[PDB]
Design a protein around this ligand. Sequence first.
Ligand code: PAR
Ligand code: MG
Ligand code: MG
Ligand code: MG
Ligand code: MG
Ligand code: MG
Ligand code: MG
Ligand code: MG
Ligand code: MG
Ligand code: MG
Ligand code: MG
Ligand code: MG
Ligand code: MG
Ligand code: MG
Ligand code: MG
Ligand code: MG
Ligand code: MG
Ligand code: MG
Ligand code: MG
Ligand code: MG
Ligand code: MG
Ligand code: MG
Ligand code: MG
Ligand code: MG
Ligand code: MG
Ligand code: MG
Ligand code: MG
Ligand code: MG
Ligand code: MG
Ligand code: MG
Ligand code: MG
Ligand code: MG
Ligand code: MG
Ligand code: MG
Ligand code: MG
Ligand code: MG
Ligand code: MG
Ligand code: MG
Ligand code: MG
Ligand code: MG
Ligand code: MG
Ligand code: MG
Ligand code: MG
Ligand code: MG
Ligand code: MG
Ligand code: MG
Ligand code: MG
Ligand code: MG
Ligand code: MG
Ligand code: MG
Ligand code: MG
Ligand code: MG
Ligand code: MG
Ligand code: MG
Ligand code: MG
Ligand code: MG
Ligand code: MG
Ligand code: MG
Ligand code: MG
Ligand code: MG
Ligand code: MG
Ligand code: MG
Ligand code: MG
Ligand code: MG
Ligand code: MG
Ligand code: MG
Ligand code: MG
Ligand code: MG
Ligand code: MG
Ligand code: MG
Ligand code: MG
Ligand code: MG
Ligand code: MG
Ligand code: MG
Ligand code: MG
Ligand code: MG
Ligand code: MG
Ligand code: MG
Ligand code: MG
Ligand code: MG
Ligand code: MG
Ligand code: MG
Ligand code: MG
Ligand code: MG
Ligand code: MG
Ligand code: MG
Ligand code: MG
Ligand code: MG
Ligand code: MG
Ligand code: MG
Ligand code: MG
Ligand code: MG
Ligand code: MG
Ligand code: MG
Ligand code: MG
Ligand code: MG
Ligand code: MG
Ligand code: MG
Ligand code: MG
Ligand code: MG
Ligand code: MG
Ligand code: MG
Ligand code: MG
Ligand code: MG
Ligand code: MG
Ligand code: MG
Ligand code: MG
Ligand code: MG
Ligand code: MG
Ligand code: MG
Ligand code: MG
Ligand code: MG
Ligand code: MG
Ligand code: MG
Ligand code: MG
Ligand code: MG
Ligand code: MG
Ligand code: MG
Ligand code: MG
Ligand code: MG
Ligand code: MG
Ligand code: MG
Ligand code: MG
Ligand code: MG
Ligand code: MG
Ligand code: MG
Ligand code: MG
Ligand code: MG
Ligand code: MG
Ligand code: MG
Ligand code: MG
Ligand code: MG
Ligand code: MG
Ligand code: MG
Ligand code: MG
Lengths: 49, 272
Amino acid sequence: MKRTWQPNRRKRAKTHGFRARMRTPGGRKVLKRRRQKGRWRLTPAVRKR
Amino acid sequence: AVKKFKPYTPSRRFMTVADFSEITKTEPEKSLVKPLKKTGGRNNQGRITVRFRGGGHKRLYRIIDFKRWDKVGIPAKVAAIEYDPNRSARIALLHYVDGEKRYIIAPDGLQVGQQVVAGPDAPIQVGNALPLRFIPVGTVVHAVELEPKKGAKLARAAGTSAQIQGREGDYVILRLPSGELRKVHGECYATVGAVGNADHKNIVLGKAGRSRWLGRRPHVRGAAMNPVDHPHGGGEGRAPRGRPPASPWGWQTKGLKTRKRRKPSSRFIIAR
RNA sequence: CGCGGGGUGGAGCAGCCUGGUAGCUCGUCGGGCUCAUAACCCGAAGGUCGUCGGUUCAAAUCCGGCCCCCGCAACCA
RNA sequence: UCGAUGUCGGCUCGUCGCAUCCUGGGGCUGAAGAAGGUCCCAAGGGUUGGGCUGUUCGCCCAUUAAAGCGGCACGCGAGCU
RNA sequence: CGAAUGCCGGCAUGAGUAACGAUAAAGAGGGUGAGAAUCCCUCUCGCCGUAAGCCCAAGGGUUCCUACGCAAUGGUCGUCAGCGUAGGGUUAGGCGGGACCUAAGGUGAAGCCGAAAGGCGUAGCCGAAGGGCAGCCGGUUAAUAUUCCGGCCCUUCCCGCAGGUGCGAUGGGGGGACGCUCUAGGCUAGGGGGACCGGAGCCAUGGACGAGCCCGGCCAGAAGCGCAGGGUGGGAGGUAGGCAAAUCCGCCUCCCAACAAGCUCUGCGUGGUGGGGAAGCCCGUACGGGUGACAACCCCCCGAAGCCAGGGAGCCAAGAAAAGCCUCUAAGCACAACCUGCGGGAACCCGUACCGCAAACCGACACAGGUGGGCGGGUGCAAGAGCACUCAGGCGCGCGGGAGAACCCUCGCCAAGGAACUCUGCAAGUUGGCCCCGUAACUUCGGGAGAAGGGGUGCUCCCUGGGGUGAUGAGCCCCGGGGAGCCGCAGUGAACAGGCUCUGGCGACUGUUUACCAAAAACACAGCUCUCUGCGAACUCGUAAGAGGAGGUAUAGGGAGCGACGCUUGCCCGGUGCCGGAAGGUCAAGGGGAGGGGUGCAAGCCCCGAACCGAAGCCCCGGUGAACGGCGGCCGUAACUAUAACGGUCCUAAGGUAGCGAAAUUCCUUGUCGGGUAAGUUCCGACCUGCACGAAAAGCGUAACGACCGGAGCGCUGUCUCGGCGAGGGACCCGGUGAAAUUGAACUGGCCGUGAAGAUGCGGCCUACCCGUGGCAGGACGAAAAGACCCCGUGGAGCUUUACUGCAGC
RNA sequence: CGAGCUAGCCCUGGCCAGGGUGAAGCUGGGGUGAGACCCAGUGGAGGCCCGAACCGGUGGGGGAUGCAAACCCCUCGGAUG
RNA sequence: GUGGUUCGUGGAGCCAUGGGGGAAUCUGGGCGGACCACCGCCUAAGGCUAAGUACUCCGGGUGACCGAUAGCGCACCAGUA
RNA sequence: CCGAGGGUAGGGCCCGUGACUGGGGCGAAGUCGUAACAAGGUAGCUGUACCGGAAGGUGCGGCUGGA
RNA sequence: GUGGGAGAGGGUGGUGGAAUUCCCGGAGUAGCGGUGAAAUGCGCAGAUACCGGGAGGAACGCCGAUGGCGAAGGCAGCCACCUGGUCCACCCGUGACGCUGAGGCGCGAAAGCGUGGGGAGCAAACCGGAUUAGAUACCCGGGUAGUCCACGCCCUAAACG
Ligand SMILES: NC[C@@H]1O[C@H](O[C@H]2[C@@H](O)[C@H](O[C@@H]3[C@@H](O)[C@H](N)C[C@H](N)[C@H]3O[C@H]3O[C@H](CO)[C@@H](O)[C@H](O)[C@H]3N)O[C@@H]2CO)[C@H](N)[C@@H](O)[C@@H]1O
Ligand SMILES: [Mg+2]
Ligand SMILES: [Mg+2]
Ligand SMILES: [Mg+2]
Ligand SMILES: [Mg+2]
Ligand SMILES: [Mg+2]
Ligand SMILES: [Mg+2]
Ligand SMILES: [Mg+2]
Ligand SMILES: [Mg+2]
Ligand SMILES: [Mg+2]
Ligand SMILES: [Mg+2]
Ligand SMILES: [Mg+2]
Ligand SMILES: [Mg+2]
Ligand SMILES: [Mg+2]
Ligand SMILES: [Mg+2]
Ligand SMILES: [Mg+2]
Ligand SMILES: [Mg+2]
Ligand SMILES: [Mg+2]
Ligand SMILES: [Mg+2]
Ligand SMILES: [Mg+2]
Ligand SMILES: [Mg+2]
Ligand SMILES: [Mg+2]
Ligand SMILES: [Mg+2]
Ligand SMILES: [Mg+2]
Ligand SMILES: [Mg+2]
Ligand SMILES: [Mg+2]
Ligand SMILES: [Mg+2]
Ligand SMILES: [Mg+2]
Ligand SMILES: [Mg+2]
Ligand SMILES: [Mg+2]
Ligand SMILES: [Mg+2]
Ligand SMILES: [Mg+2]
Ligand SMILES: [Mg+2]
Ligand SMILES: [Mg+2]
Ligand SMILES: [Mg+2]
Ligand SMILES: [Mg+2]
Ligand SMILES: [Mg+2]
Ligand SMILES: [Mg+2]
Ligand SMILES: [Mg+2]
Ligand SMILES: [Mg+2]
Ligand SMILES: [Mg+2]
Ligand SMILES: [Mg+2]
Ligand SMILES: [Mg+2]
Ligand SMILES: [Mg+2]
Ligand SMILES: [Mg+2]
Ligand SMILES: [Mg+2]
Ligand SMILES: [Mg+2]
Ligand SMILES: [Mg+2]
Ligand SMILES: [Mg+2]
Ligand SMILES: [Mg+2]
Ligand SMILES: [Mg+2]
Ligand SMILES: [Mg+2]
Ligand SMILES: [Mg+2]
Ligand SMILES: [Mg+2]
Ligand SMILES: [Mg+2]
Ligand SMILES: [Mg+2]
Ligand SMILES: [Mg+2]
Ligand SMILES: [Mg+2]
Ligand SMILES: [Mg+2]
Ligand SMILES: [Mg+2]
Ligand SMILES: [Mg+2]
Ligand SMILES: [Mg+2]
Ligand SMILES: [Mg+2]
Ligand SMILES: [Mg+2]
Ligand SMILES: [Mg+2]
Ligand SMILES: [Mg+2]
Ligand SMILES: [Mg+2]
Ligand SMILES: [Mg+2]
Ligand SMILES: [Mg+2]
Ligand SMILES: [Mg+2]
Ligand SMILES: [Mg+2]
Ligand SMILES: [Mg+2]
Ligand SMILES: [Mg+2]
Ligand SMILES: [Mg+2]
Ligand SMILES: [Mg+2]
Ligand SMILES: [Mg+2]
Ligand SMILES: [Mg+2]
Ligand SMILES: [Mg+2]
Ligand SMILES: [Mg+2]
Ligand SMILES: [Mg+2]
Ligand SMILES: [Mg+2]
Ligand SMILES: [Mg+2]
Ligand SMILES: [Mg+2]
Ligand SMILES: [Mg+2]
Ligand SMILES: [Mg+2]
Ligand SMILES: [Mg+2]
Ligand SMILES: [Mg+2]
Ligand SMILES: [Mg+2]
Ligand SMILES: [Mg+2]
Ligand SMILES: [Mg+2]
Ligand SMILES: [Mg+2]
Ligand SMILES: [Mg+2]
Ligand SMILES: [Mg+2]
Ligand SMILES: [Mg+2]
Ligand SMILES: [Mg+2]
Ligand SMILES: [Mg+2]
Ligand SMILES: [Mg+2]
Ligand SMILES: [Mg+2]
Ligand SMILES: [Mg+2]
Ligand SMILES: [Mg+2]
Ligand SMILES: [Mg+2]
Ligand SMILES: [Mg+2]
Ligand SMILES: [Mg+2]
Ligand SMILES: [Mg+2]
Ligand SMILES: [Mg+2]
Ligand SMILES: [Mg+2]
Ligand SMILES: [Mg+2]
Ligand SMILES: [Mg+2]
Ligand SMILES: [Mg+2]
Ligand SMILES: [Mg+2]
Ligand SMILES: [Mg+2]
Ligand SMILES: [Mg+2]
Ligand SMILES: [Mg+2]
Ligand SMILES: [Mg+2]
Ligand SMILES: [Mg+2]
Ligand SMILES: [Mg+2]
Ligand SMILES: [Mg+2]
Ligand SMILES: [Mg+2]
Ligand SMILES: [Mg+2]
Ligand SMILES: [Mg+2]
Ligand SMILES: [Mg+2]
Ligand SMILES: [Mg+2]
Ligand SMILES: [Mg+2]
Ligand SMILES: [Mg+2]
Ligand SMILES: [Mg+2]
Ligand SMILES: [Mg+2]
Ligand SMILES: [Mg+2]
Ligand SMILES: [Mg+2]
Ligand SMILES: [Mg+2]
Ligand SMILES: [Mg+2]
Ligand SMILES: [Mg+2]
Ligand SMILES: [Mg+2]
Ligand SMILES: [Mg+2]
Ligand SMILES: [Mg+2]
Ligand SMILES: [Mg+2]
């Protein structure tokens, strides 16, 4: 059947990107938490040009 | 007149379509004056706030003239009468000698080629606009302003009118389509005649689809729902209500008057 | 089986809960009116209060046990 | 037996008890014969096909030597429905 | 530490067990190799072929090409690989994206709002498979190419020279610019045919040296033409509108046009040049190379859904924006500038490999699932993207080999009987395409209808009739009709392709829903009715601002119910709701102080505090049922009995009318007649004693409609009597890889007892050499899930209201 | 933190072979005082019919440590809304 | 009308205060738990102000702290796979 | 080829029959009430419409076969 | 044909006042209504009665008749338009064109039906109050369809002279 993962680079970027997270206090805290944690990747890596 | 069909299909046996014979050879509209992009959307910034809206034909807005006092004294020739997707009435395309082209909402009896004009001057004829004062008591009228210089707001639906009843210092009394008795300021413009397309009420949609074409989504009964959804939801195999009939939001829907009492508008109203 | 409602002249109903007196209606009987009958009028009688028992100074009336009458319930399986 | 014993009826397969429906053996009979009634021995084998109902049962249809009762977790769902 | 269905780990059992992922299928010879069913090569075979073939987009991201490799990954093997090591490989002014535009939406200076964080928010900005925009055809690489190279062709920009003109904008206007369905003409794509032109070869096995078989007979292309079509009127005056201005546009007014004549713009045809070019055969490659060839490269036909495109015609639901483009002027500039022609010079950034219906994307897997767009050849079946076969192209689905038991899946066939099977004809059968006869009740006059039931269907020869395209003829192509005749069991000879009726229920109907057990009679629906709302509407979301409603205005918008259509919807307003009542009763804060207390020496200061004044709500008075709801008991009575039109009485707010009625409703019940049957708890018609119908939670009907539910009959069958044979895939045996839940340990028999009451394990007796293998499924209260019912717990949640208590709201 | 599954709405694009039946409306004829209306012919309507793609998920069987945490075979509904 | 305080409307002050009314400048004002007298204490409606105190990313010392199933999640290129 | 007739299939008229049901005819002395004939104690009749155990009543218009 | 006349003859548009009902204002107090008599009912929440104002619907008093017109059903305030029939004078033109009329076709009171509109009075149904033995009636107080209009149906009558 159709599963739940339907990859889209634009969506992944607009949805979970560094700039989206930065836009709101909710998201800014996510970066803070991930930084303090020592996460190698703050936001998902969306590729291609 | 109303177009009628033979039952060559079920739902074609009741279906019924407007007569478009008053639609003069001018079916597609007029750029310049109108159209605008019209912005379909069944809801506010976010959430739906009027249920069951959506779908249905794309539209172009015809930006019509609801304040006729710009062109006081300037007459215009009625050039055409065309279909307007965004109202029950039809609209008149008129050419002002000025050059300017406006649409007026098209009254019953309006003929193409006719002369029409607005102002204190203005022969009392179908199509003309006047401040309510100079209009003879008892004449039927439409596109009436509520307060002066604020635009036509009463009687624009197809086949509607108001009748002038009497006067009272600065106000003339109106009898509105609903039957209400209203004091409306003398200085309010209103155009003589009834609205026309009066056979609008006689049309039978005929099937579900037609409803959808006009963007009317299926309306579901409270009875059909559940207690979470509606006061009428549940219980077992059908149910008669079990309380005084209500809206989904709990207010009673048979009888409960809802106009706020202390409206300052009150001292200008005399009926139902 | 459990639940609670009734048994009052010939018929249908009051009366009880706040015991002490059984009343209304109809029908029955005698008298009248009419040529006559019905209607009307004037008068008149008729109830061991379902049946056993005590409760009491006294039970239609309060309390128990049976007697038929009516209405309710009888559910998860 | 609730850290589960699947619960009606049908179906397949059975198998047992006899307080025996049929067939064998009998006694009494208000047993002439034939046919019954009834009781006593006896389970070795038998114990049909349908209409209606989920039905068990039952009621009919047409036959029969007869159209037996009951147990086996209202036998049988790691066999079916 | 021994138990916590404990935690983490390791290793056992089941077990050499089930499996090895589509039943599209394989065999052999030769190579390589330490080692081959599996790797390369060849021959033969089978499978896709509106794909299982090629081209995009998304997503993936080294998976591409090559050398050397086989420990692992591959469901076996592997010399192979999408795997391991290394190296190479993606070339653009013209394709796509960006230095262009705007959509919903986002963002957002002005502005408004919010305890904060933040929420709105016109102008502008951002935002794309939408608008705008200049590249076609061939060649070379192991791997890239509309990117390189070849030929032919364009686009901007910047500086020049040459000629024209009032040039000039983010501002005006015009255009871009828009639906659906049906379409005409002329073409192109693609396809068929050819005695003609080009070709290696070919006569097989009885015949054919022949218009014989086989292969192939194009591609691109500026100008100028040619054909088809798209667009457009030209003058002059007046001008108060397009938010400054206008020579523009708009509105009047006259003349000329009414035509595509003329202007331009597309597409196609031709085009200077350029390019490709088969089968076969010989080569050594994994693959591509030469030869055929100096290839030929020509006529006929069919022909689009594609091109001309902003084409036309009808309809109602009435069909984006902005820029590029044309123009009009404004400031300003007019030694500037802009247009046209020519020259030279400038033209950046990112993507470009490969997979791409799948072994590289989404599903933990090399997964039988999912995944948008374009091409998708031929022949035959009426047609088509259907179906059968087959081009090109691509596969034989990464375990094999044997055997030929039960039993299972998938299939085929059956005497006689045809529903007896069964909860049901569940399933399976029959039927099946086209043409032609031929068709009922009913009906809203459409339909019912493919009603039913029928016949025709091939091939041969003769005669004969319309078109199409060609000239009016030839052919090639599409449709017809008539007449003889041949053959078979059988002619849509294979494949795709209704079983038909009758009568009830429910719902009108197409529609919609429980993604992953219910598709319905539930939802919706047109339509009907009630009720709210006069517009800063009611209603909804948000504290707000604000937005929806709606850029709507009572023929409009919200809420409820009912649900096409026909005939209809009775009576009760006592209770509850809703509505309407300047009276009255009651009523909080506050107004009011008659009056009483606390202090003080007093002036004072501080409390209590009754009259009466005080809203809405209630109470009370009214109305209202397509508002919540409701719509009776008993006793008698007719000249056969029976029965009760008739009466008496109690009670009510009023006591169910019509129309249905043992029902989707009927307990007693298989009610009672009647029909269908040999037989009928079901079905159909009736009676009515309606446990417990009933009129908009609508009542009684209704043609048509339905994967809805019930009953009946015909037709037909393996459903059955009642089985039997046959096929393929497994099962079984050999080689290879090889799991699982489960498991206190086990050396694990019957009966009769007994035991916590159903024993392999206790008692007595009975039987029983040790161990396996294919099978059946009675038992181990077998496995699986801390029972889903039940009850408990002062455990939890969703729900309702005249439970309490608050809160938003009014 | 989630509408990359799903539920609706908005904006922009796309897809729906091939047949059937043949409404209005025109056109001619008939009819009439003018009509209505009736005939053909044309016309090409429709939550219309058959049937692919495509969107479904009706009935049965299979599958059930599956190929699959919804699948496969036969069968069925819609397919210009 | 509320918060703060041991204070939950209590006899409820004091300190903060959203709403209404609304003074004085020392013979002025507040408080000393309703209030009033008396006796006392402070001087509101402007601000600033070390130190003693809290913490422990980071460096150092020390442990009747662990010693690779412990000790931080990580002794190991871990907020990695 | 035709063709008596036989078979399958579907329609047309007619007759018989049917639980049950509708109203109808006739049947000496059954119940109910009084509609009509006298102005019939509400003038009557009437088409239509609703309602009622029943004659009947009533609404609207009409008639004189009444005042 | 020529020239005249009477008419509630038909259709559409427009319009006048009287009266009833309701709302509003004034003034006004204890009953009004109704009948054979009563009661339901209306009214101190201010009725009836009177004044003034507004709204709306239907019907046109006097003239009016024993009258006029129409083929019938029918048709009545007033105005205009559109329009049918008809009588009279003259004897002007035609020149038998004549009468009836199966079917067909139109017309057709009232009540009723459809969709829309309107609704003042009245008024089937219905509810009450009296009268009755009962009264689903007569009388009384309410009241819905309807009566009114546009259009479409219906087609019957004591459509009677
Ligand atoms: N022939 C009379 C027709 O039927 C009806 O009349 C019938 C009934 O009304 C009538 O019934 C009458 C009754 O009215 C009257 N008051 C009492 C009488 N005993 C009855 O009588 C009836 O029954 C008896 C006995 O059985 C018979 O002998 C007698 O013939 C018969 N008429 O009997 C008639 C049938 O015979 C209509 N009313 C009348 O208009 C119609 O024309
Ligand atoms: Mg525009
Ligand atoms: Mg947002
Ligand atoms: Mg609904
Ligand atoms: Mg529900
Ligand atoms: Mg709720
Ligand atoms: Mg609720
Ligand atoms: Mg129910
Ligand atoms: Mg409810
Ligand atoms: Mg339960
Ligand atoms: Mg248990
Ligand atoms: Mg256990
Ligand atoms: Mg024995
Ligand atoms: Mg014997
Ligand atoms: Mg047995
Ligand atoms: Mg049993
Ligand atoms: Mg038992
Ligand atoms: Mg059992
Ligand atoms: Mg089972
Ligand atoms: Mg222990
Ligand atoms: Mg352990
Ligand atoms: Mg373990
Ligand atoms: Mg095993
Ligand atoms: Mg085995
Ligand atoms: Mg195996
Ligand atoms: Mg395999
Ligand atoms: Mg090797
Ligand atoms: Mg094939
Ligand atoms: Mg790699
Ligand atoms: Mg490779
Ligand atoms: Mg190699
Ligand atoms: Mg391997
Ligand atoms: Mg694998
Ligand atoms: Mg590699
Ligand atoms: Mg740049
Ligand atoms: Mg940009
Ligand atoms: Mg932009
Ligand atoms: Mg925008
Ligand atoms: Mg924002
Ligand atoms: Mg673009
Ligand atoms: Mg480009
Ligand atoms: Mg490649
Ligand atoms: Mg210029
Ligand atoms: Mg511009
Ligand atoms: Mg512009
Ligand atoms: Mg030979
Ligand atoms: Mg060319
Ligand atoms: Mg200007
Ligand atoms: Mg070559
Ligand atoms: Mg077009
Ligand atoms: Mg712009
Ligand atoms: Mg490339
Ligand atoms: Mg590529
Ligand atoms: Mg594809
Ligand atoms: Mg594989
Ligand atoms: Mg796959
Ligand atoms: Mg797909
Ligand atoms: Mg075909
Ligand atoms: Mg094709
Ligand atoms: Mg195919
Ligand atoms: Mg057989
Ligand atoms: Mg046979
Ligand atoms: Mg048969
Ligand atoms: Mg049977
Ligand atoms: Mg059986
Ligand atoms: Mg059946
Ligand atoms: Mg079947
Ligand atoms: Mg059926
Ligand atoms: Mg049916
Ligand atoms: Mg349905
Ligand atoms: Mg679905
Ligand atoms: Mg489901
Ligand atoms: Mg379905
Ligand atoms: Mg909101
Ligand atoms: Mg708004
Ligand atoms: Mg809006
Ligand atoms: Mg509405
Ligand atoms: Mg409903
Ligand atoms: Mg319903
Ligand atoms: Mg219904
Ligand atoms: Mg009702
Ligand atoms: Mg009530
Ligand atoms: Mg009430
Ligand atoms: Mg009331
Ligand atoms: Mg009230
Ligand atoms: Mg009050
Ligand atoms: Mg019954
Ligand atoms: Mg019932
Ligand atoms: Mg049968
Ligand atoms: Mg029977
Ligand atoms: Mg029977
Ligand atoms: Mg019901
Ligand atoms: Mg109801
Ligand atoms: Mg359906
Ligand atoms: Mg079989
Ligand atoms: Mg086999
Ligand atoms: Mg093996
Ligand atoms: Mg042993
Ligand atoms: Mg035992
Ligand atoms: Mg032992
Ligand atoms: Mg033992
Ligand atoms: Mg077992
Ligand atoms: Mg078991
Ligand atoms: Mg178990
Ligand atoms: Mg438990
Ligand atoms: Mg408790
Ligand atoms: Mg036609
Ligand atoms: Mg069509
Ligand atoms: Mg369709
Ligand atoms: Mg299902
Ligand atoms: Mg279909
Ligand atoms: Mg406090
Ligand atoms: Mg103080
Ligand atoms: Mg102090
Ligand atoms: Mg102090
Ligand atoms: Mg400080
Ligand atoms: Mg560790
Ligand atoms: Mg260690
Ligand atoms: Mg008959
Ligand atoms: Mg009879
Ligand atoms: Mg009478
Ligand atoms: Mg009488
Ligand atoms: Mg009388
Ligand atoms: Mg009458
Ligand atoms: Mg009456
Ligand atoms: Mg003469
Ligand atoms: Mg003469
Ligand atoms: Mg005549
Ligand atoms: Mg009438
Ligand atoms: Mg209607
Ligand atoms: Mg009245
Ligand atoms: Mg009397
Ligand atoms: Mg009355
Ligand atoms: Mg009539
Ligand atoms: Mg007369």
